[PDB]
Amino acid sequence: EWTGDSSINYYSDEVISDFHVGQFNRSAYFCIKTVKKSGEGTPIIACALSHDSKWIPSFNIMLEQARNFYITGHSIRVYVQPNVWSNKSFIEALSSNALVGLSSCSTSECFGPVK
């Protein structure tokens, strides 16, 4: 139940390009679309729901951090857990990845748990 498990995939040097907020069922949610600051590769979409999944306790710490990184535009590392959301419309629209971690990324090395 940690943002360091083998089941968590992280993408470094991401920059949060687009933000979205809404409500699914009875839970607020926010999705971040991050594009690599290279121009190669598909964007990474990570969503967090206020009252769903095992990542509820960190939702309020990921909403103000992504918004911190979206406004600043700093290069970041996104830790997501795939195949969390099940409502087909939700994955087909936004994503199935769950935003479970955010870290600050520097030029040489980038913070947070690795591997």
Partner: protein
Amino acid sequence: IDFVYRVDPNPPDVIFRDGFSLLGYNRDLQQLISGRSCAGGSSDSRYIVTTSDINKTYAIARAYYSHSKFKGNLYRYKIRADNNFYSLTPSVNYLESQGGHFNAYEKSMIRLQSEYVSTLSILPENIQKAVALVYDSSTGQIKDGTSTINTDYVSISSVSNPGVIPFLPEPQANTQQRIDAFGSLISSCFSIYSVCQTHRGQKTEVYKMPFYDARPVIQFIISGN
């Protein structure tokens, strides 16, 4: 980007011959981003700041129009960017690497502005067209009006300089200085008096825009509350 935009109240018949002129000789990048060298400060910047996002120009026009005592008409001039136009992000990274600090207040400010700085004066052949923004006061709308076209467009079809501003002054440490902003978090160096508004000696009598410190506002949006 290929085309930048600048909001100026002078009519196109005088801009197409005079253009935009440098305020002074303050080449400091730290002062320009926070506006200390622009109209909110010493008013001697060496850079003319223009935005590439069309919505930012609408923001400037809205801020100046919905102010209740600005008596004037605004014109949005589109300018062909050339090798003298620089994006502030490549130079911020370089200046921060030579022994300087750009806090998240000045990092979140360029992201909101899409600023491009011209080191020299914007020559009249760099402006392609001027759209006369019309302010329907009764409705309260800013809409594109008569879009005149300059006949001096060279049409080389060049691009901006993707490098760093040459001869950047060494950054100053422990600045603790305010960032001047107006309207919907529109930076300084975008206001009317943020350029040389003195043609043939006389000065256009329009409002002096009141600038607020952007640092509390950037913290407010970042922290959410």
